PDB file of C-alpha atoms in Angstrom:
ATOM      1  CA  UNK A1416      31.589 -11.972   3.003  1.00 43.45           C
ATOM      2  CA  UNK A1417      30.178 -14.495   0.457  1.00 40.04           C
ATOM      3  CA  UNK A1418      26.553 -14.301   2.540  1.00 41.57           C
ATOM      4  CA  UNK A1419      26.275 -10.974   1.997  1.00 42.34           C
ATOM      5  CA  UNK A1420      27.093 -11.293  -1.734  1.00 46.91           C
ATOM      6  CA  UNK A1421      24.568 -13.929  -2.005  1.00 43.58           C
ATOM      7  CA  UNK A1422      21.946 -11.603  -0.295  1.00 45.47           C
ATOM      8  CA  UNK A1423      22.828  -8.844  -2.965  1.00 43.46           C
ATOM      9  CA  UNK A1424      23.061 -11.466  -5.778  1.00 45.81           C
ATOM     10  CA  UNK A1425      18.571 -11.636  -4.542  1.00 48.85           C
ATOM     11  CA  UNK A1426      18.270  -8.116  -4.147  1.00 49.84           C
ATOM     12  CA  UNK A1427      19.840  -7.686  -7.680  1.00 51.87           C
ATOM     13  CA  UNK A1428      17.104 -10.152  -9.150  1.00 48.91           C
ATOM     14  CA  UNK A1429      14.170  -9.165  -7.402  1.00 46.58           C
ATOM     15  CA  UNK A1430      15.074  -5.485  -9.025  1.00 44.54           C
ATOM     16  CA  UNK A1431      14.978  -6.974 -12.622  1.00 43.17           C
ATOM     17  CA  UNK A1432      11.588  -8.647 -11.837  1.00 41.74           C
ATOM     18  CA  UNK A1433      10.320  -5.390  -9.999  1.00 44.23           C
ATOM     19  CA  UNK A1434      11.720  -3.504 -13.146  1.00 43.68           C
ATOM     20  CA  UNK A1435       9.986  -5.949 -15.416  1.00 40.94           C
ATOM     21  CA  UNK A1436       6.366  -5.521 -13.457  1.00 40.99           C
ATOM     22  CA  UNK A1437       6.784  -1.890 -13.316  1.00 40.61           C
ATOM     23  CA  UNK A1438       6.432  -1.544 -17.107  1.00 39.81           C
ATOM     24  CA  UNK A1439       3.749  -3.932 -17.763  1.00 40.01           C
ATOM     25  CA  UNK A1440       1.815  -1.888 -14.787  1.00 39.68           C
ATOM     26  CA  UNK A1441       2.764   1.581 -17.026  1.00 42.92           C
ATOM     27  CA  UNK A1442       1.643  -0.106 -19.978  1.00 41.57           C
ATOM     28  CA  UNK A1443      -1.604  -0.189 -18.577  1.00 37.15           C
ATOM     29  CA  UNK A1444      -1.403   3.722 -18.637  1.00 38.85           C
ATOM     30  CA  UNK A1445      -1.724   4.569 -21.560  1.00 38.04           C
ATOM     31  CA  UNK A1446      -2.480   7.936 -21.548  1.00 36.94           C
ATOM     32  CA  UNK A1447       0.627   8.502 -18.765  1.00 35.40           C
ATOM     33  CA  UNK A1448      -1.490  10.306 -16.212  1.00 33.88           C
ATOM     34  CA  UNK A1449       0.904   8.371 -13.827  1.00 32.19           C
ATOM     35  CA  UNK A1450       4.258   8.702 -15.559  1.00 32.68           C
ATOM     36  CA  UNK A1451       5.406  12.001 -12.888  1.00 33.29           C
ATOM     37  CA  UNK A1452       5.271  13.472  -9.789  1.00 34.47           C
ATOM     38  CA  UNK A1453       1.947  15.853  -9.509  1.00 34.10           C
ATOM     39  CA  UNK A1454       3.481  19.300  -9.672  1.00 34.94           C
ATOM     40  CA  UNK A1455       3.365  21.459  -6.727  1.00 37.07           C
ATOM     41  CA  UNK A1456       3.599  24.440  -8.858  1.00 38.52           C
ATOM     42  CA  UNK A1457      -0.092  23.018 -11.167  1.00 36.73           C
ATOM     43  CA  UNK A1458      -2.043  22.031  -7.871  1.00 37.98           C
ATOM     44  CA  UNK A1459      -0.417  24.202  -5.163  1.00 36.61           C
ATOM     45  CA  UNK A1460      -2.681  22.390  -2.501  1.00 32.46           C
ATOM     46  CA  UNK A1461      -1.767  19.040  -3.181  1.00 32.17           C
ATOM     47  CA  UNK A1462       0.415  18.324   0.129  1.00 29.91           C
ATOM     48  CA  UNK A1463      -2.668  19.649   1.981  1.00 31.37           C
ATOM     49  CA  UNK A1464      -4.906  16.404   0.653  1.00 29.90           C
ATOM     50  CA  UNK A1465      -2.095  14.078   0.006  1.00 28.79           C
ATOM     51  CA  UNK A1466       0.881  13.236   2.611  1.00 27.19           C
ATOM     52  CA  UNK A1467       2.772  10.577   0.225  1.00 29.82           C
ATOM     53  CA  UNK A1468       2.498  11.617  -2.986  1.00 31.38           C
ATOM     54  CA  UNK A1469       3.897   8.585  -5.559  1.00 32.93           C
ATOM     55  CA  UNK A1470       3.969   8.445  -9.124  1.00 33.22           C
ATOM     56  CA  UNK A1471       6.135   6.302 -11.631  1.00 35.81           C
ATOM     57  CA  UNK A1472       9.201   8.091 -12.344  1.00 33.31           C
ATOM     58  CA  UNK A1473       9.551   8.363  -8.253  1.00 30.86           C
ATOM     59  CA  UNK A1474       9.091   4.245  -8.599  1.00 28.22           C
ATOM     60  CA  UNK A1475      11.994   4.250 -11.012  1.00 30.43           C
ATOM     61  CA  UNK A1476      14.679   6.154  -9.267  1.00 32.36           C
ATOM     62  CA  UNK A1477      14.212   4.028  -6.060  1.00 33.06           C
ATOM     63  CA  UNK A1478      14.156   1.084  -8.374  1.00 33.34           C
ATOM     64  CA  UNK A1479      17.277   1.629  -9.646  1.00 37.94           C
ATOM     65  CA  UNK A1480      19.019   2.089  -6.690  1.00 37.47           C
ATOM     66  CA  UNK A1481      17.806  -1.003  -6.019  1.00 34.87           C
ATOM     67  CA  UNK A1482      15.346   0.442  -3.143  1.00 32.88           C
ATOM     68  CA  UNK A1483      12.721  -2.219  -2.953  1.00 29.99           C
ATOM     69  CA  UNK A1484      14.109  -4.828  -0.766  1.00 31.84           C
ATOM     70  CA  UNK A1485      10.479  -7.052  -1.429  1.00 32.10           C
ATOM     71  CA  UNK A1486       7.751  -6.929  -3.440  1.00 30.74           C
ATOM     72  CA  UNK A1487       5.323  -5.715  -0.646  1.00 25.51           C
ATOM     73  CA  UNK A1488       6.928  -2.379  -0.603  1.00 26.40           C
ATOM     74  CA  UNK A1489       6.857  -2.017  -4.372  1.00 26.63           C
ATOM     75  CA  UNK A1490       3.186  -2.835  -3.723  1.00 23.78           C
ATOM     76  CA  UNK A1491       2.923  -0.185  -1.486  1.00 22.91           C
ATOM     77  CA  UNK A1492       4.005   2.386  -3.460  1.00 21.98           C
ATOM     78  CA  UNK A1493       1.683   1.231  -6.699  1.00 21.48           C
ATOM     79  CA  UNK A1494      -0.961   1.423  -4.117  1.00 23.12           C
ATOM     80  CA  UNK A1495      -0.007   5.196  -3.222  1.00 26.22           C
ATOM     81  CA  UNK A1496      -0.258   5.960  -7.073  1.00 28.81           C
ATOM     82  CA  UNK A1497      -3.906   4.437  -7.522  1.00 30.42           C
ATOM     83  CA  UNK A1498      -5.262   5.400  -3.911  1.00 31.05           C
ATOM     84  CA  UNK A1499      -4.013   9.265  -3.875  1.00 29.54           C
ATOM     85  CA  UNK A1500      -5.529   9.716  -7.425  1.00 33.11           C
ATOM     86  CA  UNK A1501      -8.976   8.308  -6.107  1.00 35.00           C
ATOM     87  CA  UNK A1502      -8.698  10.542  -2.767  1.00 36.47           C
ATOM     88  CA  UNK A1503      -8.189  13.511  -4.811  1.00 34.89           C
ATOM     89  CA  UNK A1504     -10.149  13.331  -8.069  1.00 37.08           C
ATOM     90  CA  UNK A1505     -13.589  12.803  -7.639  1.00 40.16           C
ATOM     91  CA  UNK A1506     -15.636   9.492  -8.934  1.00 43.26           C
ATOM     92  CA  UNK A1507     -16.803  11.422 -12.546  1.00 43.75           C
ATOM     93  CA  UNK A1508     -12.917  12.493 -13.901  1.00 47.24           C
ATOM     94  CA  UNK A1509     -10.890  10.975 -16.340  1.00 47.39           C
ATOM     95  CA  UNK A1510      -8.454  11.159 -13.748  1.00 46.55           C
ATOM     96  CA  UNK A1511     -10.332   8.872 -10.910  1.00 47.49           C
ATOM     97  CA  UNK A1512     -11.675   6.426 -13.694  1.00 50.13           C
ATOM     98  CA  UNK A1513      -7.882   5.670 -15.271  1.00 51.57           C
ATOM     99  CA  UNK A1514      -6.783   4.842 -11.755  1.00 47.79           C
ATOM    100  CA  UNK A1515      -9.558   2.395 -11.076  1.00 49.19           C
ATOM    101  CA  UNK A1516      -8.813   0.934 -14.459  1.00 48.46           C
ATOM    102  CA  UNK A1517      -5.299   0.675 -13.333  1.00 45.94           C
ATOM    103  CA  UNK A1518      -5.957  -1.104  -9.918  1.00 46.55           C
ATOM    104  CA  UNK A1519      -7.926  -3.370 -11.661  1.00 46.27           C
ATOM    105  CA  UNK A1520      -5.466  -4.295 -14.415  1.00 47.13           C
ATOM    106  CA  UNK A1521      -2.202  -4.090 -12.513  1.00 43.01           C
ATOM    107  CA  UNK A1522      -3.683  -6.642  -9.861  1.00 42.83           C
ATOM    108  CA  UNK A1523      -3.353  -9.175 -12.960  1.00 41.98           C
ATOM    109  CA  UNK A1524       0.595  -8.988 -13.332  1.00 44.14           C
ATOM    110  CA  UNK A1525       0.615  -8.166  -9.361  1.00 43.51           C
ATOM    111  CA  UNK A1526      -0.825 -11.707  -8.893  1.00 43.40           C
ATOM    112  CA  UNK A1527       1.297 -13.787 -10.982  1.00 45.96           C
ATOM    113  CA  UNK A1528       4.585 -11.671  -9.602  1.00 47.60           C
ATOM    114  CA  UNK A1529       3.820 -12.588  -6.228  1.00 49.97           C
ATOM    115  CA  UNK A1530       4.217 -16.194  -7.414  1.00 51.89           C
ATOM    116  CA  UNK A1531       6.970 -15.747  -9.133  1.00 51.65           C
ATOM    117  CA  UNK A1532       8.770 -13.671  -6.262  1.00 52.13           C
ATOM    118  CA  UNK A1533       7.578 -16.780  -3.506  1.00 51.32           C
ATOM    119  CA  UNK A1534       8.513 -19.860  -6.446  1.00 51.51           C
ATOM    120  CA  UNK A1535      12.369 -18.168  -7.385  1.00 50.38           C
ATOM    121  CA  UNK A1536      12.534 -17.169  -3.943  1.00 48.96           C
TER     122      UNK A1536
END
């Protein structure tokens, strides 16, 4: 049907935004302490402390299959990046302090996408 053409005409755009905020949020990661999956071989305990692990690559792949179907679940999953990290590093790493740095600069481009996701529709 055209309707559901229409519907993935949206879905198609809302990807390209979503794909445009995810690298300005990885951009404010410099040092790309977010760029993969933590690796279960490196911190063997990590599923014992963290039930949804998320990083940006993981972002990616369901991006491009066009797996965000709005921009609150895109959220959640930047969320999962920045909230694990602080859960298990403690308040003194490197590792804690460049997700709080994150938060607090990805809530910049997360504010004016929201707008942009409501004004476009």
């Amino acid at each position: 049907s055209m309707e559901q053409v229409a519907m993935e005409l949206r879905l198609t755009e809302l990807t390209r935004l979503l794909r445009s905020v995810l690298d300005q949020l990885q951009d404010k990661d410099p040092a790309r302490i977010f760029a993969q999956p933590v690796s279960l071989k490196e911190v063997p305990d990590y599923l014992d402390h963290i039930k949804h692990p998320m990083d940006f690559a993981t972002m990616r792949k369901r991006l491009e299959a066009q797996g965000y179907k709005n921009l609150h679940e895109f959220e959640e999953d930047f969320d999962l990046i920045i909230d694990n990290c602080m859960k298990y590093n403690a308040r003194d790493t490197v590792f804690y302090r460049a997700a709080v740095r994150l938060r607090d600069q990805g809530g910049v481009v997360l504010r004016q996408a929201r707008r942009e996701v409501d004004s476009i529709g």
